[PDB]
Design an enzyme around this catalytic site. Structure first.
Site, mmCIF file in Angstrom:
data_model
loop_
_atom_site.group_PDB
_atom_site.id
_atom_site.type_symbol
_atom_site.label_atom_id
_atom_site.label_comp_id
_atom_site.label_asym_id
_atom_site.label_seq_id
_atom_site.Cartn_x
_atom_site.Cartn_y
_atom_site.Cartn_z
ATOM 1 N N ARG B 374 109.805 -15.392 -6.753
ATOM 2 C CA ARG B 374 109.765 -16.334 -5.613
ATOM 3 C C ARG B 374 108.694 -16.032 -4.579
ATOM 4 O O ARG B 374 108.532 -16.809 -3.643
ATOM 5 C CB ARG B 374 111.110 -16.380 -4.890
ATOM 6 C CG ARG B 374 112.306 -16.755 -5.764
ATOM 7 C CD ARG B 374 113.547 -16.609 -4.884
ATOM 8 N NE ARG B 374 114.753 -16.421 -5.696
ATOM 9 C CZ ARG B 374 115.520 -17.389 -6.128
ATOM 10 N NH1 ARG B 374 115.262 -18.633 -5.869
ATOM 11 N NH2 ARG B 374 116.583 -17.112 -6.824
HETATM 12 N N1 LIG Z 1 107.705 -27.321 -6.955
HETATM 13 C C1 LIG Z 1 107.511 -26.087 -7.449
HETATM 14 N N2 LIG Z 1 106.244 -25.751 -7.608
HETATM 15 C C2 LIG Z 1 106.030 -24.506 -8.059
HETATM 16 N N3 LIG Z 1 106.954 -23.581 -8.332
HETATM 17 C C3 LIG Z 1 108.219 -23.981 -8.166
HETATM 18 C C4 LIG Z 1 108.552 -25.219 -7.735
HETATM 19 N N4 LIG Z 1 109.896 -25.427 -7.634
HETATM 20 C C5 LIG Z 1 110.386 -24.234 -8.022
HETATM 21 N N5 LIG Z 1 109.384 -23.307 -8.320
HETATM 22 C C6 LIG Z 1 109.506 -21.877 -8.575
HETATM 23 O O1 LIG Z 1 110.856 -21.424 -8.325
HETATM 24 C C7 LIG Z 1 110.912 -20.652 -7.101
HETATM 25 C C8 LIG Z 1 111.137 -21.587 -5.887
HETATM 26 O O2 LIG Z 1 112.460 -22.137 -5.971
HETATM 27 P P1 LIG Z 1 113.595 -21.759 -4.906
HETATM 28 O O3 LIG Z 1 113.562 -22.770 -3.820
HETATM 29 O O4 LIG Z 1 113.447 -20.352 -4.453
HETATM 30 O O5 LIG Z 1 114.802 -21.906 -5.898
HETATM 31 P P2 LIG Z 1 116.329 -21.837 -5.502
HETATM 32 O O6 LIG Z 1 116.944 -23.128 -5.904
HETATM 33 O O7 LIG Z 1 116.960 -20.753 -6.294
HETATM 34 O O8 LIG Z 1 116.373 -21.552 -3.943
HETATM 35 C C9 LIG Z 1 109.545 -19.957 -7.067
HETATM 36 O O9 LIG Z 1 109.552 -18.836 -7.928
HETATM 37 C C10 LIG Z 1 108.614 -21.011 -7.654
HETATM 38 O O10 LIG Z 1 107.498 -20.442 -8.352
#
Ligand SMILES: Nc1ncnc2c1ncn2[C@@H]1O[C@H](COP(=O)(O)OP(=O)(O)O)[C@@H](O)[C@H]1O
Ligand SMILES: Nc1ncnc2c1ncn2[C@@H]1O[C@H](COP(=O)(O)OP(=O)(O)OP(=O)(O)O)[C@@H](O)[C@H]1O
Ligand SMILES: Nc1ncnc2c1ncn2[C@@H]1O[C@H](COP(=O)(O)OP(=O)(O)O)[C@@H](O)[C@H]1O
Ligand SMILES: [Mg+2]
Ligand SMILES: [Mg+2]
Ligand SMILES: [Mg+2]
Lengths: 51, 509, 86, 456, 177, 456, 51
Positions: B374
């Site tokens: 992340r």
């Molecule tokens: N729109 C996106 N563009 C690029 N990476 C994404 C995207 N959506 C999810 N990811 C990937 O997943 C993570 C971000 O999602 P996050 O908001 O942290 O998920 P969660 O639902 O678990 O909170 C990062 O590791 C990112 O690389």
């Protein structure tokens, strides 16, 4: 090699120290068990009463 | 074996004896069962306070019922009996802290178990603490090199991030975390390895491997082996966390490995069931989520103002950090279990290890489709950030394409180009144990793949090509590798320098 | 051996020291013993029927669902947070 | 002083003692009118203690007098135990008279310290192809034979006792924990007729026994092995079934007043296992090489008992029912079985690459199983067809007739050296045997015998 | 659940009633008699019988105590029996005395020494403890040869140890640690 | 008057008060000396109340005196809360000193009546292709971003805040519930650097905090939003994880003396969720537009918590782990996602037909995917081969690089409009781009850039 | 090194055997909280014979 020698050497000092401490406690108990009597209690109960 | 020295060492304890009277709060042992002791009379005992029993045995107060106190023994309990006096120390659980612990093996309470003498630390700290608040933190923008190109390119770890290592039994979870500790011996990052519920010979073998790789002098090893009290196994991660936090709070960087949080959860479940607390989703206590969330939220990056305030101005203009690498074991790949579900929901990313890939000879066994970071590109140097952009998602799409086009007739150039490239990057991500790569070595390997130089190379020769290229650049181009390794910088001069070297390599080797 | 029943509270036991037969004198009236999660336990109401409606202070109403040997377990037909012990 | 039985529930008994004379945890007690032994597990308060009976409780009643012995269950140790059979309490059960013991040791002890640990990596040859290839053993290390009912554990172990005794010259200790009484009789007479008995100590607590016996027999056998290790010797410790020690603990757990954990197991499952398993180790004084059979309930390797045991072993041998159904014995699964000794720095690159090559071929064959079942072998690529043909030959060459299995079929047993094992599998991987028929590799010991079998 | 958790409702009810009617000494004697009477080998058996009703067991205990139970104390026994709590009578008296002592600003202090100490010393310890605790102190002095010298004071949950034995133990722990 | 702490077990504390002075349900209590607050959950009887601590219990002791405050937890409300960071009890958790409060409201309230409900259907543009196509939002409505661990809930919420909150001229509330302390700091500095902070009230309760805090932070943020709504304003309410409110109730439920329901959840799961979700609504006085992120345990949408949540939302956006595992972002599933606004009478027939057209093509492709992997693509009909190619292209054209994802993607961020989204999907459905390669639609904003990517 | 440790060990062993008496009387003197020499030297020569 060399570090392991000092590891063994200090463990021997501690093994001896563990026996010297037990003997010193045993010795202290026998000395106090003969040196203390009614003339000492009046100097201990009175001491505690101030604490 | 010098005499008289021992006498003055003993005299130093006798001369400093507390001969005056003390006012204490006390109780009496009522029952002794499975590491749990019940007491009557401890009116001023606080929750989590240390209880003093006869013969220097210590316990901890966990149940403060109206008529009784439930305490857990911090060692062997079989020597305790009904009618013994229980005393009260006005102190919370504390452990020694400082640089004096580096290169030492200690128990969950900080006592040395390596036989290398006493630890002359000059500072103790509480085992249970609350992490620094929102306004004191800073965003993650510094790298933590594990030395593995599959991890450092696709799932990067930054200073203050928490990255889960998860998979089944016997597939390289400990090997990945121990190699990450070995790679920090020259990085300036201090290391902590916490062993929970492991056999003592396995712990001794990890310490021998750290020593064989020159990494032990930069590592603190905290051991709570399989025969030790469930209380010590439950407390060990918090003790190790406290030893790592010493560096974070003083404007320094640290790394901590919890070799098995699933074994810490099993030890906590035992204590809770023996205390008769009502069970949850798989006989685990209701607060098993909070067990791990309270531990893992301490791993963070703190701002210069927090370090400046903690050190009373002694350290200025420097941030501090604690990076964590928790490990979790799954049963036959089942991630739906209560503990894995909780921990996967707390960390800043995860590295999934797959048994089918491990049996197929892909030995780092990282599933690129399921594994994710992340913090991403903020946790990478300029050169690796540019050379690795999109590799993770490209491999995820290659695995699907390889299965979809498996028995179909010959496809277009776009399909052949993607498939032939994915096969080469798949063979490139393979690495051996105890063999880490520097920024320059990983960079040459990434450059030769993404710039198209591997297109003429056979899949069965990718490993030999990489090893030969690195050996070539190390001999003919040592000044360029030294320039890339200063900060991992990238520009047209370095790009052209690498291009000229790879062309000359393939045209003559 | 067995844990404390809902009727084993000091305000109730103290009342029986004065008049042994204090209960059953007003079989249509009881006192709230505990309140939690929309459920109210009452001491008395010796003649309540299963499913009958109970009247509380402030125009609040409940229904009798557990007619136990020592007390009545009632559920509130509205907001329970305004009810209290006694 | 003495106490009085206050409650009896199955194998668990509560005894009340004067407040100034309450016995310690693990202390042994004796009932006055029957001489039945009890082991104290916990102190309940008010002078009452809870204990497990080391025998049958039928005929016992409330109010009987109980004597505290002042110590834990103590068993005879040393040279006097060799060639003798003993029970959980250290009594002789072979009708050969009293044991000529010089000293007795209490069955409860702490594990050797972190500083006492040994770093041994010396390879131990078993003479069994699959084990020597993918599960190399080491002297002073721990081995576990995992398997469901009727898969090969007692046969594959008895073949290891026979093969390891060729190079080993020291003593052995055998602990029979909750298994068949007939197999203890068969093993005793086999060694007595073979003159091997004077170098083995035998302890038994079989399936016929009450829960207290089955729960403590493992500790009695280990206490005898620890005496020989601490004398500076190299000894072998064999445990007939380590799962029975944990199971005897499950039968008694609810009677001890403990709340159950997942699938009905005791909450103390991992601690009860660690307290025993950590004592079974080699030290700087002497070495203990140990082999333990691990039962797998209803063939489920994810069950809490088997799942908790893997972390305590150096080599893990996983037996399979699917493999045993095809005719292959020993029924080891190369893809699930593993060892700490399978390292290039320990066994050398030639062995390591041969083992890795075999696992790669068997893994790829396992991925094609569903396609082969639906579409048949003829739809595979020219590369997959060649790999499947070699996988079938490797899978058959892993089989081996044992010298203890001769009674079942009639075939003579085979001992295969590590050199012959590596040479055979390396040749099959290189393609040196692509022309020989698939049935020529089944039950033939060394690779040269596959060449002679193909002539028929 | 401890007997103190279960006896608390009864002892607190008996104390609040005895206090409100100024009968603290009468109920101390009545509960002392019931706690003593219910512990008798013949009464303990009678109270354990499965065929007797709660009102029968209670009337039997009231008839045995008689004079010592005023009408309120008799109403209490019928209540303890109706709730089937007659086994708690020994614990019920004890909690009643603790509420009484805390109300009466009184503290019973146990004291132990190796061998006898003078009235001058007892009165010096008594004034010091009363000045520290701000309560009336009743010193239950006694001797214990296990002490090599000095004295130990136990004011409920608070302990003050000035004995030579406690100092030998501090040294033994200091040297072993 | 005052009470005394009688018992402490984890985060739950029992306090005794005089019988004539028992504190009310949900009443706030304060411990003497120690800096801790308690909330009455239940009145146990005999003057005892059961409470959850709003801080750590490590310093607490039995016998500490506790003061009844006569009211529930009361937090500051109004204009003084804008541009500030606060905890559950409303204390400032930023170094900016005391809050300039003029009024305080209790966190426990009744939901608006049936007669007070709003009825608006004003469409809200988000700038995200998939959302604007199959999940059209509306002003004053409730939106839910469903997904497991690591699929994009926070990232999509950050893109929605950027495309709505910044441009909006009303007040906003952001509530971080059980959020990572790093995400709250990252968001604060973005609002600070963007000059948006003067429009937002920030409330934080991260995973490092006690169960009582995580059980009440959602009520604190909602109490601030209700003050703005009741003033006649249009308000934005963002919640990073509503699942953590339910989880805090599960963690404390068993110690509050409640028997467990299915999947180990608290028996009050549907009422505790209804009491909170019915307050998050638009009324005749003013409006609340809310976007909530919903965690899905182990990706199973049938788990009691996610399953009970769908009925409370107008727009349901579902994120799929299988799409994220293919590098496609945003990882939204067009077949499981939905919105009450997807009606021809609310938007138009052209939009609706395009959305149902995309769904039809993707639904048919789902049954063919498993066929091609075993028997190959060449065996399908001339209409199926063409449809499969369009489905794989549509599946890629759903992807779009976000401005908040530049650190993960490397490429720049793209905002796409409703008309641009409709035109691009109609072009792929009608066959206007059948000649372009499949890789040209992956990560490219509007349809023009896909035509340009095909040339590179 | 193990041979040197075995050869030097008796030199310290007889030295700690002489120091036990000093350690015991100094330990008793601290515990007593007053000078003990007048009631300790005759104790040392009579009790040290058992150590
Ligand atoms: N729109 C996106 N563009 C690029 N990476 C994404 C995207 N959506 C999810 N990811 C990937 O997943 C993570 C971000 O999602 P996050 O908001 O942290 O998920 P969660 O639902 O678990 O909170 C990062 O590791 C990112 O690389
Ligand atoms: N990169 C590698 N190359 C080759 N072999 C490797 C590599 N990494 C790990 N292995 C080997 O595979 C095995 C992995 O064991 P390891 O202890 O690290 O796994 P684990 O998941 O932690 O196992 P366990 O569950 O017992 O703790 C070891 O034999 C190790 O030497
Ligand atoms: N070649 C063989 N043919 C038939 N049975 C065999 C053969 N080799 C081993 N066995 C089986 O091995 C088993 C040995 O014990 P096992 O059942 O595996 O362990 P346990 O009884 O201890 O659970 C025997 O019951 C026997 O049926
Ligand atoms: Mg490991
Ligand atoms: Mg068997
Ligand atoms: Mg988030």
């Amino acid at each position: 090699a060399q570090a392991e020698i000092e590891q063994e050497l200090n463990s021997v000092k501690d093994a001896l120290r563990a026996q010297v401490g037990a003997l010193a406690v045993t010795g202290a108990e026998k000395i106090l068990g003969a040196s203390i009597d009614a003339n000492a209690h009046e100097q201990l109960v009175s001491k505690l009463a101030a604490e | 074996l010098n005499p008289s020295e021992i006498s003055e060492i003993i005299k130093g304890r006798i001369e400093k004896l507390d001969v005056a009277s003390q006012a204490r709060n006390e109780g009496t042992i009522v029952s002794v069962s499975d590491g749990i002791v019940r007491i009557y009379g401890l009116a001023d005992v606080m929750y989590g306070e240390m209880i003093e029993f006869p013969g220097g045995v210590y316990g901890m107060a966990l149940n403060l019922e109206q008529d009784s106190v439930g305490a857990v023994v911090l060692g062997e309990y079989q020597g305790l009996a009904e009618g013994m006096n229980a005393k009260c120390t006005g102190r919370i659980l504390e452990v020694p802290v400082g640089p004096e612990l580096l290169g030492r093996v200690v128990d969950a309470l900080g006592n040395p178990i390596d036989g290398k003498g006493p630890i002359d630390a000059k500072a103790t700290d509480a085992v249970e603490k609350v992490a620094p608040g929102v306004i004191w933190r800073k965003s993650v923008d510094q790298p933590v090199q594990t030395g593995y190109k599959s991890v450092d390119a696709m799932i990067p770890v930054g200073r203050g991030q928490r990255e889960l290592i998860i998979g089944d039994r016997q597939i390289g979870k400990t090997a990945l975390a121990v190699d990450a500790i070995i790679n920090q011996k020259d990085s300036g990052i201090k290391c902590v390895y916490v062993a929970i519920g492991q056999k003592q010979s396995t712990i001794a073998n990890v310490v021998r491997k750290l020593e064989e790789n020159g990494a032990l002098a930069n590592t603190i090893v905290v051991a709570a082996s399989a025969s030790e009290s469930a209380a010590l196994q439950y407390l060990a991660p918090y003790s190790g966390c406290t030893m790592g936090e010493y560096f974070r709070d003083r404007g320094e960087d640290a790394l901590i490995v919890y070799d098995d949080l699933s074994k810490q959860a099993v030890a906590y479940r035992q204590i809770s069931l023996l205390l008769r607390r009502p069970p949850g989703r798989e006989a685990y206590p209701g607060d098993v989520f909070y067990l791990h969330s309270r531990l893992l939220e301490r791993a963070s990056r703190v701002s210069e103002e927090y370090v400046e305030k903690f050190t009373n101005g002694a350290v200025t203009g420097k941030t501090g950090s604690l990076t964590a690498l928790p490990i979790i074991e799954t049963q036959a790949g089942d991630v739906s279990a209560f503990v894995p579900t909780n921990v996967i929901s707390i960390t800043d990313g995860q590295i999934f290890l797959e048994s089918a890939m491990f049996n197929s000879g892909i030995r780092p066994a990282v599933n690129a489709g399921i594994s994710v970071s992340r913090v991403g590109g903020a946790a990478q140097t300029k050169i690796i950030k540019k050379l690795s952009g999109g590799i993770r998602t490209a491999l995820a799409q290659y695995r699907e394409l390889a299965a979809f086009a498996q028995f179909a007739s010959d496809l277009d150039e776009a399909t052949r180009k993607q498939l032939e490239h994915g096969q080469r990057v798949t063979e490139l991500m393979k690495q051996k144990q105890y063999a880490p790569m520097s920024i320059a070595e990983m960079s040459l390997s990434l450059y030769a793949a993404e710039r198209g130089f591997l297109q003429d190379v056979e899949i069965a020769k990718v490993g030999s090509f990489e090893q030969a290229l690195i050996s070539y650049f190390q001999r003919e181009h040592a000044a360029l590798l030294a320039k890339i390794n200063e900060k991992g910088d990238f520009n047209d001069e370095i790009d052209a320098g690498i291009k000229a070297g790879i062309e000359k390599f393939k045209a003559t080797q | 051996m067995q844990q404390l029943n809902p009727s084993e509270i000091s305000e109730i036991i103290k009342g029986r020291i004065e008049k042994l037969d204090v209960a059953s004198q007003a079989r249509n009236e009881g006192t709230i013993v505990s309140v939690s999660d929309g459920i109210v336990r009452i001491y008395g109401l010796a003649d309540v029927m299963y499913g009958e409606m109970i009247e509380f202070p402030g125009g609040v109403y409940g229904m009798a669902l557990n007619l136990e040997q020592d007390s009545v377990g009632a559920v509130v037909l509205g907001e329970y947070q305004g009810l209290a012990e006694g | 002083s003495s106490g009085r039985i206050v409650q009896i529930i199955g194998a668990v008994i509560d005894v009340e003692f004067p407040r100034d004379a309450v016995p310690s945890i693990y202390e042994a007690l004796k009932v006055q009118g029957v001489e039945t032994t009890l082991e104290v597990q916990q102190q309940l308060g008010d002078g009452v203690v809870r204990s497990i009976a080391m025998g049958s409780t039928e005929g016992l009643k409330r109010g009987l007098n109980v004597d505290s012995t002042g110590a834990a269950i103590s068993v005879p140790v040393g040279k006097a135990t060799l060639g003798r059979i003993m029970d959980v309490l250290g009594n002789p059960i072979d009708e050969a008279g009293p044991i000529g013991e010089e000293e007795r040791w209490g069955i409860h002890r702490e594990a050797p310290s972190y500083a006492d640990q040994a770093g041994g990596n010396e390879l131990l040859e078993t003479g069994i192809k699959v084990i020597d290839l993918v599960c190399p053993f080491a002297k002073g290390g721990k081995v576990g034979l995992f398997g469901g009912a009727g898969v090969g554990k007692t046969v594959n172990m008895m073949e290891l006792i026979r093969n390891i005794a060729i190079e080993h010259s020291g003593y052995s200790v055998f602990a029979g924990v909750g298994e068949r009484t007939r197999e203890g009789n068969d093993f005793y007479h086999e060694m007595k007729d073979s003159n091997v008995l004077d170098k083995v100590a035998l302890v038994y607590g079989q399936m016929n026994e009450p829960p207290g016996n089955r729960l403590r027999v493992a500790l009695t056998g280990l206490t005898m092995a620890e005496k020989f290790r601490d004398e500076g010797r190299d000894v072998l410790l064999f445990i007939d079934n380590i799962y029975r020690y944990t199971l005897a603990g499950t039968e008694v757990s609810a009677l001890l007043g403990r709340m159950p954990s997942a699938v009905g197991y005791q909450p103390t499952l991992a601690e009860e296992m660690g307290v025993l398993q950590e004592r079974i180790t080699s030290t700087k004084k002497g070495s203990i090489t140990s082999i333990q059979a691990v039962y797998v309930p209803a063939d489920d390797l994810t069950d809490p008992s088997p799942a908790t045991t893997f972390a305590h072993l150096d080599a893990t041998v996983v037996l399979s029912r699917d493999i045993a159904s095809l005719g292959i014995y020993p029924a080891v699964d190369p893809l699930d079985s593993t060892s700490r000794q399978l390292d290039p720095l320990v066994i050398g690159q030639d062995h390591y690459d041969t083992a890795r090559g075999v696992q790669y071929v068997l893994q790829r064959y396992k991925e094609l199983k569903d396609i082969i079942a639906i579409l048949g072998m003829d739809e595979l690529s020219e590369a997959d067809k060649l790999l499947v043909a070699r996988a079938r030959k490797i899978q058959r060459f892993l089989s081996q007739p044992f010298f203890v299995a001769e009674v079942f079929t009639g075939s003579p047993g085979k001992y295969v050296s590590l050199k012959d094992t590596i040479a055979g599998f390396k040749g099959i991987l290189n393609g040196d045997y692509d022309h020989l028929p698939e049935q020529a590799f089944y039950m033939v010991g060394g690779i040269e015998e596959a060449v002679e079998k193909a002539k028929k | 659940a401890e007997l103190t958790t279960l006896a608390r409702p009864y002892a607190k009810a008996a104390f609040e009633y005895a206090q409100a009617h100024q009968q603290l000494a009468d109920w101390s004697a009545a509960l002392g008699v019931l706690a003593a009477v219910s512990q008798d080998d013949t009464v303990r058996q009678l109270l354990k019988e499965p065929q007797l009703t709660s009102s029968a067991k209670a009337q039997s205990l009231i008839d045995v105590c008689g004079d010592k139970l005023n009408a309120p104390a008799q109403n209490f026994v019928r209540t303890v029996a109706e709730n089937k709590r007659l086994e708690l009578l020994p614990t019920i008296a004890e909690m009643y005395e603790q509420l009484k002592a805390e109300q009466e600003k009184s503290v019973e202090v146990e004291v132990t020494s190796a061998f006898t100490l003078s009235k001058e010393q007892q009165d010096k310890l008594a004034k010091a403890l009363s000045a520290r605790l701000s309560r009336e102190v009743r010193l239950h002095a006694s001797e214990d040869a296990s002490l090599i010298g000095g004295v130990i004071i136990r004011a409920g949950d608070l302990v003050i140890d000035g004995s030579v034995r406690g100092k030998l133990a501090k040294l033994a722990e200091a040297l072993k640690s």
